[PDB]
Amino acid sequence: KQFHTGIEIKVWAIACFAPQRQCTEVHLKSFTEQLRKISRDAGMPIQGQPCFCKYAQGADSVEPMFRHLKNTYAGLQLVVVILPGKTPVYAEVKRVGDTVLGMATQCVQMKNVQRTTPQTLSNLCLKINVKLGGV
């Protein structure tokens, strides 16, 4: 797909389902900073400060967390979900986001948060661009 202009992601959250001892606060902050810069450079700026950034454990935590987000943050545009490898969490994020609450979500693997690359960040940006683009 082609790149869609006019996207500005002001209200967004991080839900980290990877263990904090593996994906620490500094990893999260660093990843967020890198994402802020590349999305900005591309003309789909994601603001540096998420409205919410918390750890959770297990697929069962997905629905309560997303409901909380929907109920707390008006105009929420995106939830970025960090996954610990291959996990039932992924299917649950898709079920809850797409079919239950109608919330835009984008998953990213823990390994790409611990150590980012421009390529993996670009992959993430393009996926988000498709989701929020209106075509």
XYZ file of N, CA, C and O in Angstrom:
540
model
N 0.818 -1.207 0.000
C 0.000 0.000 0.000
C 0.854 1.260 0.000
O 2.000 1.255 0.458
N 0.276 2.344 -0.506
C 0.945 3.632 -0.530
C 0.875 4.311 0.831
O 0.002 4.016 1.650
N 1.796 5.235 1.060
C 1.855 5.975 2.315
C 0.741 7.017 2.402
O 0.546 7.812 1.478
N 0.015 7.007 3.514
C -1.073 7.956 3.742
C -0.618 9.129 4.604
O -0.015 8.942 5.666
N -0.909 10.339 4.132
C -0.525 11.553 4.834
C -1.667 11.986 5.746
O -2.785 11.474 5.646
N -1.376 12.917 6.643
C -2.406 13.507 7.479
C -2.652 12.787 8.789
O -3.567 13.150 9.528
N -1.851 11.765 9.076
C -1.965 11.047 10.344
C -1.134 11.731 11.417
O 0.050 12.023 11.210
N -1.769 12.026 12.547
C -1.064 12.514 13.725
C -1.560 11.741 14.930
O -2.715 11.860 15.319
N -0.685 10.938 15.514
C -1.099 10.102 16.630
C -0.747 10.792 17.945
O 0.383 10.697 18.430
N -1.724 11.510 18.498
C -1.544 12.252 19.744
C -1.879 11.448 20.999
O -1.226 11.600 22.030
N -2.905 10.611 20.920
C -3.363 9.871 22.090
C -3.151 8.377 21.885
O -3.879 7.739 21.123
N -2.146 7.822 22.543
C -1.844 6.408 22.377
C -1.251 5.794 23.644
O -0.736 6.496 24.516
N -1.325 4.473 23.730
C -0.927 3.754 24.919
C 0.010 2.601 24.590
O -0.024 2.052 23.496
N 0.820 2.228 25.568
C 1.614 1.015 25.485
C 1.136 0.010 26.522
O 1.034 0.326 27.713
N 0.869 -1.205 26.065
C 0.580 -2.317 26.953
C 1.678 -3.351 26.775
O 1.777 -3.970 25.715
N 2.509 -3.540 27.798
C 3.654 -4.428 27.662
C 3.395 -5.762 28.311
O 3.367 -5.864 29.535
N 3.227 -6.784 27.485
C 2.956 -8.120 27.995
C 4.218 -8.944 28.171
O 4.176 -10.079 28.668
N 5.351 -8.353 27.792
C 6.647 -8.939 28.093
C 7.027 -8.612 29.529
O 6.676 -7.555 30.047
N 7.750 -9.526 30.185
C 8.100 -9.312 31.592
C 9.010 -8.102 31.726
O 9.913 -7.918 30.919
N 8.771 -7.289 32.741
C 9.592 -6.113 32.958
C 11.072 -6.453 33.118
O 11.937 -5.698 32.684
N 11.385 -7.584 33.745
C 12.796 -7.928 33.918
C 13.479 -8.208 32.575
O 14.709 -8.220 32.485
N 12.683 -8.425 31.532
C 13.231 -8.660 30.196
C 13.113 -7.419 29.304
O 14.018 -7.093 28.536
N 11.994 -6.727 29.425
C 11.751 -5.533 28.634
C 11.510 -4.377 29.603
O 10.370 -4.095 29.986
N 12.604 -3.731 30.010
C 12.578 -2.775 31.115
C 12.006 -1.425 30.722
O 11.749 -1.153 29.545
N 11.850 -0.560 31.712
C 11.299 0.759 31.451
C 12.197 1.512 30.490
O 11.710 2.225 29.605
N 13.508 1.343 30.633
C 14.412 2.075 29.748
C 14.339 1.550 28.310
O 14.490 2.313 27.363
N 14.116 0.251 28.147
C 13.905 -0.301 26.810
C 12.652 0.324 26.200
O 12.649 0.719 25.024
N 11.583 0.390 26.991
C 10.333 0.976 26.513
C 10.525 2.433 26.108
O 10.027 2.864 25.070
N 11.227 3.195 26.937
C 11.423 4.618 26.650
C 12.275 4.810 25.420
O 12.012 5.686 24.599
N 13.302 3.984 25.284
C 14.197 4.091 24.139
C 13.476 3.755 22.837
O 13.570 4.474 21.847
N 12.742 2.654 22.851
C 11.953 2.229 21.708
C 10.962 3.334 21.309
O 10.810 3.673 20.118
N 10.285 3.899 22.309
C 9.297 4.941 22.054
C 9.947 6.145 21.413
O 9.406 6.710 20.459
N 11.094 6.547 21.948
C 11.855 7.649 21.350
C 12.211 7.367 19.885
O 12.009 8.223 19.018
N 12.725 6.174 19.589
C 13.073 5.849 18.202
C 11.847 5.864 17.299
O 11.894 6.366 16.176
N 10.744 5.317 17.795
C 9.502 5.337 17.038
C 9.009 6.760 16.796
O 8.476 7.056 15.729
N 9.168 7.628 17.792
C 8.742 9.030 17.671
C 9.485 9.697 16.529
O 8.900 10.407 15.702
N 10.792 9.474 16.489
C 11.621 10.142 15.495
C 11.345 9.660 14.067
O 11.181 10.472 13.154
N 11.280 8.348 13.855
C 11.048 7.863 12.494
C 9.630 8.185 12.014
O 9.435 8.540 10.851
N 8.639 8.076 12.901
C 7.280 8.389 12.484
C 7.179 9.864 12.133
O 6.482 10.232 11.190
N 7.861 10.698 12.910
C 7.923 12.143 12.662
C 8.577 12.419 11.313
O 8.050 13.168 10.482
N 9.739 11.807 11.102
C 10.495 12.000 9.869
C 9.660 11.599 8.654
O 9.725 12.245 7.608
N 8.855 10.547 8.800
C 7.990 10.060 7.713
C 6.711 10.877 7.490
O 6.040 10.703 6.479
N 6.363 11.753 8.426
C 5.160 12.558 8.274
C 3.905 11.872 8.793
O 2.785 12.158 8.343
N 4.099 10.954 9.737
C 2.994 10.357 10.493
C 3.342 10.379 11.977
O 3.429 9.333 12.626
N 3.538 11.579 12.532
C 4.118 11.748 13.868
C 3.329 11.066 14.978
O 2.146 11.343 15.168
N 4.004 10.175 15.700
C 3.467 9.598 16.925
C 4.106 10.362 18.075
O 5.325 10.396 18.191
N 3.300 10.985 18.927
C 3.879 11.802 19.988
C 4.684 10.981 21.003
O 4.407 9.797 21.233
N 5.701 11.617 21.582
C 6.675 10.919 22.398
C 6.119 10.377 23.697
O 6.623 9.386 24.225
N 5.084 11.019 24.222
C 4.555 10.609 25.520
C 3.251 9.834 25.377
O 2.215 10.426 25.089
N 3.291 8.510 25.596
C 2.013 7.789 25.596
C 1.186 8.202 26.803
O 1.743 8.595 27.827
N -0.132 8.112 26.686
C -1.011 8.499 27.781
C -1.010 7.454 28.896
O -1.531 7.696 29.981
N -0.402 6.301 28.623
C -0.491 5.127 29.479
C 0.618 4.178 29.066
O 0.822 3.941 27.880
N 1.344 3.642 30.040
C 2.366 2.645 29.745
C 2.481 1.726 30.932
O 3.048 2.098 31.953
N 1.910 0.535 30.816
C 1.909 -0.400 31.933
C 2.252 -1.808 31.480
O 2.073 -2.167 30.309
N 2.761 -2.595 32.414
C 2.988 -4.013 32.187
C 1.744 -4.814 32.546
O 0.981 -4.453 33.452
N 1.561 -5.925 31.848
C 0.502 -6.863 32.184
C 0.989 -8.261 31.863
O 1.961 -8.440 31.141
N 0.320 -9.258 32.422
C 0.733 -10.630 32.206
C -0.465 -11.466 31.810
O -1.495 -11.446 32.486
N -0.325 -12.189 30.706
C -1.304 -13.188 30.326
C -2.421 -12.658 29.461
O -2.832 -11.501 29.591
N -2.914 -13.521 28.579
C -3.998 -13.165 27.679
C -5.223 -12.684 28.449
O -5.951 -11.830 27.975
N -5.457 -13.231 29.638
C -6.621 -12.812 30.415
C -6.577 -11.349 30.837
O -7.616 -10.765 31.149
N -5.388 -10.751 30.843
C -5.278 -9.346 31.234
C -5.643 -8.370 30.127
O -5.888 -7.193 30.402
N -5.692 -8.863 28.892
C -5.946 -8.023 27.722
C -7.289 -7.303 27.782
O -7.351 -6.082 27.674
N -8.371 -8.055 27.964
C -9.688 -7.436 27.921
C -9.897 -6.371 29.015
O -10.336 -5.271 28.720
N -9.575 -6.690 30.276
C -9.703 -5.673 31.329
C -8.839 -4.442 31.057
O -9.270 -3.326 31.329
N -7.633 -4.638 30.539
C -6.775 -3.487 30.273
C -7.341 -2.606 29.160
O -7.379 -1.383 29.288
N -7.789 -3.222 28.070
C -8.325 -2.460 26.954
C -9.621 -1.753 27.359
O -9.871 -0.625 26.967
N -10.448 -2.417 28.157
C -11.654 -1.755 28.622
C -11.296 -0.541 29.462
O -11.895 0.528 29.317
N -10.315 -0.708 30.338
C -9.825 0.407 31.136
C -9.336 1.565 30.274
O -9.649 2.723 30.538
N -8.564 1.253 29.238
C -8.066 2.284 28.340
C -9.218 3.034 27.659
O -9.236 4.261 27.625
N -10.180 2.286 27.124
C -11.322 2.886 26.440
C -12.091 3.789 27.390
O -12.602 4.841 27.003
N -12.137 3.382 28.651
C -12.937 4.094 29.650
C -12.236 5.276 30.299
O -12.858 6.049 31.028
N -10.942 5.418 30.033
C -10.139 6.405 30.736
C -9.602 7.493 29.818
O -9.550 8.663 30.199
N -9.222 7.110 28.602
C -8.587 8.042 27.681
C -9.466 8.380 26.484
O -9.583 7.603 25.541
N -10.100 9.546 26.528
C -10.910 9.988 25.403
C -10.028 10.190 24.168
O -8.914 10.690 24.271
N -10.535 9.808 23.004
C -9.827 10.043 21.757
C -8.596 9.173 21.586
O -7.706 9.478 20.793
N -8.536 8.089 22.351
C -7.452 7.123 22.199
C -7.386 6.629 20.757
O -8.393 6.207 20.192
N -6.200 6.677 20.156
C -6.072 6.371 18.732
C -5.411 5.031 18.441
O -5.623 4.439 17.384
N -4.590 4.564 19.366
C -3.769 3.385 19.113
C -3.270 2.781 20.415
O -2.854 3.502 21.327
N -3.309 1.455 20.497
C -2.604 0.762 21.563
C -1.491 -0.076 20.952
O -1.751 -0.933 20.104
N -0.261 0.198 21.369
C 0.894 -0.596 20.951
C 1.131 -1.693 21.984
O 1.315 -1.416 23.181
N 1.090 -2.942 21.534
C 1.183 -4.071 22.449
C 2.496 -4.814 22.256
O 2.806 -5.261 21.162
N 3.263 -4.963 23.328
C 4.540 -5.655 23.230
C 4.376 -7.114 23.643
O 3.872 -7.402 24.729
N 4.755 -8.024 22.747
C 4.536 -9.460 22.968
C 5.826 -10.190 23.308
O 6.849 -9.960 22.673
N 5.771 -11.103 24.292
C 6.919 -11.969 24.587
C 6.961 -13.188 23.662
O 6.591 -14.286 24.087
N 7.415 -13.016 22.428
C 7.473 -14.123 21.489
C 6.101 -14.656 21.113
O 5.128 -13.900 21.032
N 6.026 -15.967 20.889
C 4.795 -16.621 20.454
C 3.909 -16.881 21.653
O 4.280 -17.632 22.547
N 2.734 -16.255 21.654
C 1.884 -16.186 22.833
C 0.403 -16.085 22.443
O 0.065 -15.485 21.422
N -0.485 -16.683 23.254
C -1.936 -16.555 23.079
C -2.371 -15.112 23.265
O -3.503 -14.755 22.923
N -1.476 -14.287 23.803
C -1.781 -12.871 23.969
C -2.131 -12.237 22.618
O -3.053 -11.423 22.528
N -1.407 -12.611 21.561
C -1.621 -12.009 20.240
C -3.038 -12.216 19.723
O -3.699 -11.257 19.325
N -3.514 -13.459 19.755
C -4.873 -13.748 19.308
C -5.891 -12.986 20.148
O -6.903 -12.531 19.635
N -5.611 -12.837 21.439
C -6.542 -12.141 22.324
C -6.572 -10.633 22.068
O -7.622 -10.001 22.151
N -5.418 -10.049 21.771
C -5.390 -8.638 21.419
C -6.221 -8.386 20.162
O -6.966 -7.404 20.074
N -6.104 -9.277 19.189
C -6.868 -9.144 17.956
C -8.367 -9.307 18.193
O -9.169 -8.525 17.698
N -8.741 -10.312 18.971
C -10.142 -10.516 19.272
C -10.728 -9.307 19.996
O -11.784 -8.791 19.612
N -10.066 -8.861 21.063
C -10.604 -7.751 21.850
C -10.609 -6.422 21.073
O -11.590 -5.691 21.084
N -9.504 -6.109 20.415
C -9.391 -4.852 19.689
C -10.328 -4.767 18.503
O -11.016 -3.766 18.308
N -10.361 -5.824 17.703
C -11.124 -5.802 16.452
C -12.606 -6.101 16.631
O -13.452 -5.396 16.078
N -12.925 -7.143 17.392
C -14.309 -7.594 17.478
C -15.077 -7.086 18.692
O -16.296 -6.941 18.636
N -14.383 -6.809 19.787
C -15.103 -6.435 20.997
C -15.219 -4.926 21.188
O -16.321 -4.405 21.402
N -14.096 -4.221 21.102
C -14.073 -2.814 21.491
C -13.850 -1.849 20.336
O -13.991 -0.643 20.506
N -13.494 -2.376 19.170
C -13.223 -1.529 18.018
C -12.110 -0.521 18.272
O -12.241 0.672 17.974
N -11.014 -1.010 18.828
C -9.842 -0.204 19.128
C -8.692 -0.605 18.217
O -8.397 -1.793 18.069
N -8.043 0.390 17.616
C -6.870 0.150 16.790
C -5.708 -0.346 17.657
O -5.354 0.269 18.671
N -5.132 -1.478 17.279
C -4.006 -2.026 18.019
C -2.894 -2.397 17.070
O -3.135 -2.720 15.903
N -1.667 -2.350 17.569
C -0.541 -2.825 16.792
C 0.424 -3.546 17.703
O 0.880 -2.975 18.694
N 0.725 -4.801 17.375
C 1.627 -5.600 18.188
C 3.049 -5.472 17.686
O 3.272 -5.244 16.508
N 4.002 -5.612 18.597
C 5.415 -5.591 18.252
C 6.078 -6.636 19.129
O 5.694 -6.813 20.277
N 7.057 -7.345 18.580
C 7.749 -8.371 19.341
C 8.744 -7.767 20.321
O 9.435 -6.798 20.003
N 8.820 -8.357 21.512
C 9.730 -7.901 22.550
C 11.149 -7.698 22.041
O 11.836 -6.747 22.433
N 11.605 -8.594 21.172
C 12.992 -8.517 20.723
C 13.252 -7.223 19.962
O 14.359 -6.676 20.006
N 12.225 -6.720 19.285
C 12.376 -5.477 18.528
C 12.170 -4.213 19.350
O 12.370 -3.096 18.846
N 11.772 -4.389 20.612
C 11.725 -3.295 21.573
C 13.029 -3.215 22.364
O 13.553 -2.123 22.602
N 13.575 -4.373 22.739
C 14.860 -4.429 23.427
C 15.990 -3.872 22.584
O 16.847 -3.153 23.085
N 16.012 -4.254 21.312
C 16.986 -3.722 20.366
C 16.270 -3.324 19.078
O 15.824 -4.171 18.301
N 16.170 -2.030 18.844
C 15.448 -1.560 17.669
C 16.370 -1.497 16.462
O 17.588 -1.365 16.605
N 15.780 -1.596 15.274
C 16.479 -1.255 14.042
C 15.587 -0.330 13.220
O 14.374 -0.383 13.328
N 16.196 0.526 12.400
C 15.382 1.367 11.514
C 14.406 0.541 10.689
O 13.266 0.959 10.515
N 14.839 -0.616 10.201
C 13.957 -1.479 9.413
C 12.742 -1.988 10.174
O 11.621 -1.947 9.671
N 12.946 -2.473 11.397
C 11.807 -2.959 12.170
C 10.880 -1.807 12.590
O 9.665 -1.965 12.615
N 11.454 -0.646 12.900
C 10.642 0.544 13.203
C 9.831 0.996 11.991
O 8.671 1.361 12.104
N 10.456 0.950 10.824
C 9.759 1.231 9.578
C 8.616 0.245 9.348
O 7.520 0.646 8.956
N 8.870 -1.043 9.580
C 7.814 -2.058 9.468
C 6.615 -1.668 10.313
O 5.474 -1.751 9.867
N 6.892 -1.265 11.551
C 5.850 -0.882 12.500
C 5.092 0.364 12.004
O 3.861 0.417 12.013
N 5.833 1.363 11.540
C 5.212 2.578 11.024
C 4.269 2.291 9.869
O 3.172 2.835 9.806
N 4.703 1.447 8.945
C 3.873 1.131 7.793
C 2.596 0.395 8.187
O 1.533 0.654 7.632
N 2.710 -0.527 9.133
C 1.536 -1.235 9.611
C 0.555 -0.253 10.232
O -0.648 -0.325 9.988
N 1.071 0.671 11.035
C 0.213 1.674 11.662
C -0.420 2.582 10.610
O -1.594 2.926 10.706
N 0.360 2.951 9.594
C -0.117 3.827 8.535
C -1.298 3.208 7.785
O -2.291 3.878 7.489
N -1.199 1.916 7.505
C -2.288 1.199 6.860
C -3.540 1.245 7.733
O -4.635 1.505 7.248
N -3.365 0.999 9.025
C -4.507 0.900 9.938
C -5.230 2.222 10.128
O -6.458 2.261 10.179
N -4.480 3.311 10.222
C -5.090 4.607 10.495
C -5.346 5.490 9.257
O -5.746 6.647 9.404
N -5.156 4.940 8.053
C -5.165 5.713 6.815
C -6.459 6.033 6.062
O -6.459 6.929 5.215
N -7.551 5.313 6.324
C -8.848 5.657 5.735
C -9.106 5.255 4.279
O -10.000 5.792 3.601
N -8.326 4.301 3.781
C -8.508 3.820 2.418
C -8.471 2.298 2.376
O -7.769 1.674 3.180
